[PDB]
Amino acid sequence: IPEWKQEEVDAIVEMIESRNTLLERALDD
Amino acid sequence: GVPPTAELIKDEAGFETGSGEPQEDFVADLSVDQVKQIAEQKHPDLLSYDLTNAAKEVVGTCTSLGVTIE
């Protein structure tokens, strides 16, 4: 449950709002 | 194209050679204004979008030569 993997997703969900797994992760949100 | 940073500094710095030990031996100084100009001579040689970042790069060789800022 690395913190950076958690921070990444948020950073991504932040751009979508305004690693493939992390993208799918951010998208699923 | 445009000449290298190291040299551009040695011009407005008023000196020629750096110090045997960077930051540990201050050779010259540079007003932020002066640095704003150097960052204008290398607009192409740098990846930075804003002029701010362009300075960070330029202001990356200075302190590592004894080129203090004011």
Next chain:
RNA sequence: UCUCGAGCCCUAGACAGCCGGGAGGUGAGCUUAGAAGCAGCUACCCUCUAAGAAAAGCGUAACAGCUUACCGGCCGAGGUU
């Protein structure tokens, strides 16, 4: 080769392999006729960014060139100490 134990990593994809990226200021400064990761000395900073050293090992007269770091992909279950 068999058996028992401890720590850490892992399907938010581990370990290995293969493919792709390994970038700009800038060939850092100094030394030097020259030295551009890689003779020596000192420093070892910041942009772009998903990464990418002021460079870990060869390589060069010096470049070039070849890989490590680091990131991404394919793969898919244990792996490592």
